[PDB]
């Protein structure tokens, strides 16, 4: 849970360097989806997507 | 040498030639009614009749 | 032996930001070094892209401004990064000043004097970017601010008339105001890092005023971490300002274009001005106005000679600590009363609060020193 | 008099910290614009570019632009002939001159409506009660030339009050109050002065899930690497 | 134009009180408005220099 | 005299005798109070040091002592003072022997 | 102000530090660190505040005054 | 046309705060009716019921519209 | 002005200079008006 992953990533420094990119790439990728589903949720209605779907 | 050097930056800083082309002008007071201003620019400030 | 204590480069990277004997004791008040630091090159390099997007000249300043805004992808955000950069630079120099004045580091004097003459560029370089956007204030503040400089008989109007690039706010002021706000902060640089210089060559302080020779702790990597902490507390307040409510601090009149004949009514400094041109119009007088007000920064030169207490900082000196709140409150005072129309109470009290300010200053911490050097039988 | 006064707080749809505009409601404002305020104001820095994603499709933005017939230059013979404009062109002025404008006016130069929500002492309700409040003075006469409107510096405007009940009757239901024109009107030029009112609510709210994510983590490293000052320990043995 | 407490020119800056001639009651106010070198031509002008 | 109250109420109040500190813990060093600091005997020299630790440590954790350790006035074992007094009048006299 | 080393002279002193890894990230952040704000607030408010309800005083003062100069009319 | 805006203002102004502007509207149409060809012309009763019933109109409009 | 000292006096360039047209610009009313011009003009654009 802890031990497996300081084990794998966190001795050397080079799967460190790794891990932090390929964390960021998956980071940007689900936060972009969590801020796009929260902010085109609290404007529910008056966003241009919807009036573009009317067209 | 260096206090004519510095005379010529500090007069480069100075003005200009076309800055120093104002001059004249007439002004008409003949349409304003009664108990009222007036503005006209002259050498970049106004001018109250 | 070591790679960095033989290179050239690295000593100088190794008596700075590695292994400085840093005190063990400085609180968050001495976080504000590093955050003006952070604060310059921010200022600097979303500066230097708004130079990139810039044509200064009083026909289409305006209008390559709005163009930046509108048209110039993101340069809403960093326009906005470089106006409240600079709100927030001034509230960090504030509390830097708030800070060696406070705990008593007005006792070294060569830093202190570095510091006051980078105080002065600071002003002055801010208000040259002030007049830059030339709108209506901006026009205003350039034309009023010049002939306070021409206030001074004898040198004023020969003066004014040679740094107006003619004889009112033409193009040759608003170029000249663009190429020396576009000089001075690397000045400012150089200034810091002698300021810097004379600091490690001193030494720090601490909230205590005891010298802390026997605790030096490193600078990296606690302080390092630290100042990294607070960089991240002020970009979040610097970028929530820039993100939720641009306008609470700007002027709501700036955006007008330059008409040379309206003048209008609520005419005001950008916030941290306030109480220059607060104890300005609160002295009916041309010349002792704009005295005061220098006499106001030669104050602050003033201070270390005036340091007849005994122990170091004010922690340990509370009547004295009583009043350097009343300074604060009064500056504060200062502040919000420049920022306001002038009538009567206003009259009054500005006057009252110029008063005071100088009071406190000049008498009252002598007083109080003189009052602790009695008290503890010394 | 000098009384001035402070316009209410209206509860806008974009009063929130995170909330944004209504684009049919910027549509209705520029279908407004159009038809109404555009015979005597100014929008210069408003071009119809920024009108077609916002708002409107791609298509009815070159027939917007296609209505009205601007300018060009030289055909290679210097006679400066009528375009009808594709889409780069900036909103026709209507008077070229400052002193055109003030020649078919009380004086009174029409300001420019590109930031007149921003220039303002008020936001947008500002001109919500500008354009409302039209009503009488009590015993003050002034000349018969200019009106009276109490949110005013001066209390007299040289404004026609433009809205009178249904001369628009636009494209949906909807008919033309008072309130609604005023509502699209004020949604339109909080649009044209701050045209990313959007993108910066967006990254505000990313930005607020950030300080949200490092705020407690880079505050545990601090915390973590200065845990050896706060527990250390001291004694003092002479000999 | 027509304020202050005179019925007068207000200077808003810092708060000179001159009037509709010009003259100053209370304020920062060194001296009194600036004259022009003003000539009347016959009907309605005024040559100002 | 109620001065002594006064004396009393502020070494209380004043803030150096919550975190151990003596008198002449706090006392401010231009070189006049180098000198007298370096006229010590060992004993008190070392224990000044110490009690400077103790207080550089405490105001880095923010923390003061408990009420069963805080330094009294009727204690107050004032040392640096003849030093000091010595320190001021052969400088005075240095200065005054330049003067004439 | 200069390196270490060559700064101060210290007799028999012993310093003792744990290991950061050994010892918790926060001890105890909500049974001290409230007491410990609580007690900082109350010996520094009678210091600093009484001159802020004197500017608060001052604002709702010059208030009310300019209201009085201009609401009869 | 059935205006929303003047049906709000008619039915906002029944609060008490704005019904003792109303009337102190109409003391001063008496005082310069009374005081008459005079240079004190109702400024401040205006403004304060201006003041009062628009910010009532700001409470409870935009529901409707 | 340029020739105000080089190759003529003062007053025979402000009448080489008030021999020709400038078109200048608004008036109160605000089309255009022409104009003599003393010395702020440039040599005038023979074509557009
Ligand atoms: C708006 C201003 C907001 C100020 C907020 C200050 C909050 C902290 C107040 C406080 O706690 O003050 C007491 C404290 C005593 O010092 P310390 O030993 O650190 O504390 C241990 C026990 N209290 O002292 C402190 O914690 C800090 C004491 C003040 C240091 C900063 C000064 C504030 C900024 C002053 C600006 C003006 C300076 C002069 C500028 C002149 C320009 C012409
Ligand atoms: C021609 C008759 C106009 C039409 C149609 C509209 N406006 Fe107007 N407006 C006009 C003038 C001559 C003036 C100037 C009056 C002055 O003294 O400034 C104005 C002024 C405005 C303002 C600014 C007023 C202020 O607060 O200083 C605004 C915001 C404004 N006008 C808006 C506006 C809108 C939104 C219109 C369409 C509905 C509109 N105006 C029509 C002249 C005319
Ligand atoms: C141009 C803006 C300034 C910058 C960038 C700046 C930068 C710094 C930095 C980086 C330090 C070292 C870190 C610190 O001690 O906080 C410092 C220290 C200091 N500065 Fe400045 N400074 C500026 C303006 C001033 C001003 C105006 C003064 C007042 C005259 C001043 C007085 C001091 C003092 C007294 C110290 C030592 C503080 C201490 O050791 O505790 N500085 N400055
Ligand atoms: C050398 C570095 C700098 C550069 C290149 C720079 C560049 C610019 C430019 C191009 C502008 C015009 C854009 C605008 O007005 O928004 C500007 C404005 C401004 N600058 Fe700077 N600047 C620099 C440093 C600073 C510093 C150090 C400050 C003060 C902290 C400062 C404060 C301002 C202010 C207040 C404005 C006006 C902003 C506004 O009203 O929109 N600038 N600067």
Redesign the pocket.
């Given at each position: 849970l802890t031990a497996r992953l300081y084990s794998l990533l966190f001795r050397r420094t080079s799967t460190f360097a790794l891990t932090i990119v390929v964390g960021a790439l998956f980071f940007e990728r689900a936060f972009d989806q969590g801020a796009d589903a929260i902010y085109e949720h609290i404007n529910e209605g008056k966003l241009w997507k919807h009036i573009k779907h009317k067209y | 040498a260096a206090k004519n050097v510095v005379s010529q930056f500090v007069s480069s800083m100075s003005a200009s030639a076309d800055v120093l082309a104002m001059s004249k002008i007439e002004i008409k007071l003949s349409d304003i009614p009664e108990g009222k201003n007036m503005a006209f620019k002259w050498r970049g400030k106004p001018l109250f009749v | 032996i070591n790679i960095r204590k033989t290179h050239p480069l690295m000593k100088i990277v190794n008596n700075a930001f590695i292994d400085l004997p840093a005190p063990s004791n400085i609180s968050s008040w001495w976080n504000f070094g590093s955050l003006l630091g952070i604060?310059?090159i921010l200022?600097?390099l979303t500066?230097?892209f708004?130079?990139m997007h810039?044509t200064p000249d009083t026909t289409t300043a305006f209008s390559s401004?709005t163009h930046?805004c509108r048209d110039v992808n993101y340069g809403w955000i960093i326009?906005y990064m470089?106006?409240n950069?600079?709100s927030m630079?001034?509230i960090c120099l504030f509390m830097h000043v708030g800070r060696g004045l406070y705990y008593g580091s007005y006792t070294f004097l060569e830093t202190w004097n570095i510091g006051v003459i980078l105080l002065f560029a600071?002003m002055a370089?801010?208000f040259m970017?002030?007049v830059?956007?030339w709108?209506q204030m901006?026009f205003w503040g350039a034309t009023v601010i010049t002939n306070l400089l021409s206030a001074i008989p004898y040198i004023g109007t020969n003066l004014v008339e040679w740094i107006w690039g003619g004889f009112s706010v033409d193009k040759a002021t608003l170029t000249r105001f663009?190429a020396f706000?576009?000089?001075?902060?690397?000045i400012?640089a150089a200034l810091a890092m002698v300021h810097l210089l004379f600091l490690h060559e001193t030494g720090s302080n601490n909230p205590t005023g005891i010298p802390s020779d026997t605790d030096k702790i490193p600078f990296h990597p606690y302080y390092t971490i630290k100042d990294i902490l607070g960089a991240i507390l002020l970009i979040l307040i610097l970028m929530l300002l820039v993100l939720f409510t641009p306008d609470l601090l700007?002027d709501p009149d700036?955006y007008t274009p330059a008409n040379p004949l309206n003048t209008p009514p609520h005419i005001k400094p950008?916030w941290y001005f306030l109480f220059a041109y607060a104890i300005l119009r609160s002295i009916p007088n041309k010349l002792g106005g704009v005295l005061a007000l220098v006499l106001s920064i030669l104050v602050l030169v003033i201070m270390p000679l005036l340091h007849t207490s005994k122990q170091r900082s004010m922690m340990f000196r509370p009547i004295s600590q009583c009043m350097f709140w009343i300074l604060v409150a009064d500056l504060l005072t200062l502040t919000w009363i420049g920022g306001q129309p002038v009538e009567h109470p206003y009259i009054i009290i500005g006057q009252l609060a110029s008063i005071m300010y100088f009071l406190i200053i000049l008498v009252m911490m002598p007083v109080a020193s003189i009052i602790e050097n009695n008290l503890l039988k010394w | 008099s000098d009384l001035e006064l402070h316009p209410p707080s209206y509860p806008w749809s974009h009063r929130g910290l995170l909330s944004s505009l209504d684009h049919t409601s910027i549509r209705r404002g520029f279908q407004v614009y159009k038809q109404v305020c555009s015979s005597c104001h100014s929008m210069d820095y408003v071009a119809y570019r920024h009108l077609v994603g916002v708002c409107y499709t791609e298509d009815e933005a070159k027939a917007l632009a296609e209505e009205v017939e601007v300018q060009d230059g030289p055909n290679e013979d210097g006679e400066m002939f009528m375009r009808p404009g594709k889409l780069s062109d900036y909103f026709p002025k209507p008077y070229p001159n400052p002193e055109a404008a003030r020649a078919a006016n009380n004086g009174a130069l029409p300001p420019d409506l590109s930031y007149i929500v921003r220039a303002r002492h008020g936001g947008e309700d500002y001109v919500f009660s500008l354009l409302t409040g039209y009503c009488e003075p009590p015993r003050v006469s002034l000349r018969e030339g200019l009106y009276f409107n109490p949110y005013f510096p001066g209390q007299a405007i040289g404004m026609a009050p433009p809205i009178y009940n249904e001369v628009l009757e636009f494209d949906d239901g909807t008919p033309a109050t008072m309130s609604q024109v005023a509502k699209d009107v004020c949604t339109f030029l909080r649009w044209a002065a701050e045209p990313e009112h959007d993108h910066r609510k967006r990254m505000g709210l990313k930005m607020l899930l950030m300080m949200g994510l490092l705020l407690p983590l880079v505050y545990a490293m601090k915390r973590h690497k200065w845990s050896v000052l706060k527990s250390r320990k001291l004694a003092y043995r002479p000999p | 134009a027509n304020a202050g407490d005179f019925g007068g020119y207000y200077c808003p800056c810092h708060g000179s009180h001159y009037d509709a001639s010009g003259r100053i009651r209370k304020g920062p106010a060194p001296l009194n408005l600036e004259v022009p070198s003003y000539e009347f031509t016959s009907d309605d002008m005024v040559i100002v220099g | 005299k109620w001065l002594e109250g006064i004396r009393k109420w502020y070494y209380n109040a004043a803030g150096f005798n919550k975190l151990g500190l003596m008198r002449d813990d706090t006392i401010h060093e231009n070189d006049d109070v180098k000198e007298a600091i370096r006229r010590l005997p060992e004993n008190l020299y070392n224990d000044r040091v110490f009690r400077i630790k103790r207080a550089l440590d405490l105001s880095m954790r923010q923390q003061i002592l408990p009420k069963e350790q805080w330094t009294k006035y009727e204690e107050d074992k004032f040392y640096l003072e003849p030093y000091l007094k010595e320190v001021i009048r052969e400088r005075k006299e240095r200065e005054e022997w330049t003067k004439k | 102000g200069r390196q270490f080393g060559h700064l101060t002279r210290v007799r028999h002193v012993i310093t003792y530090s744990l290991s950061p890894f050994e010892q918790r990230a926060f001890p105890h952040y909500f049974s001290k660190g409230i007491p410990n704000v609580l007690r900082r607030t109350r010996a520094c408010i009678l210091r600093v505040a009484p001159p802020f309800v004197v500017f608060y005083l001052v604002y709702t003062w010059g208030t009310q005054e300019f209201e009085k100069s201009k609401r009869k009319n | 046309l059935v205006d929303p805006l003047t049906t709000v203002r008619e039915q906002c102004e029944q609060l008490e705060k704005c019904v003792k502007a109303r009337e102190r509207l109409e003391l001063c149409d008496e005082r310069v009716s009374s005081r008459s060809q005079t240079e004190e012309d109702c400024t401040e009763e205006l403004f304060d019921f201006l003041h009062a019933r628009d910010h009532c109109v700001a409470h409870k409009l935009f529901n409707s519209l």
């Open positions: - | - | 604060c310059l200022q600097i500066g230097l708004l130079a810039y401004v930046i326009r470089h106006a950069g600079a630079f001034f600071t370089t801010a970017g002030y830059l956007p709108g901006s663009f706000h576009f000089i001075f902060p690397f400012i700007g700036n950008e | - | - | - | - | -």
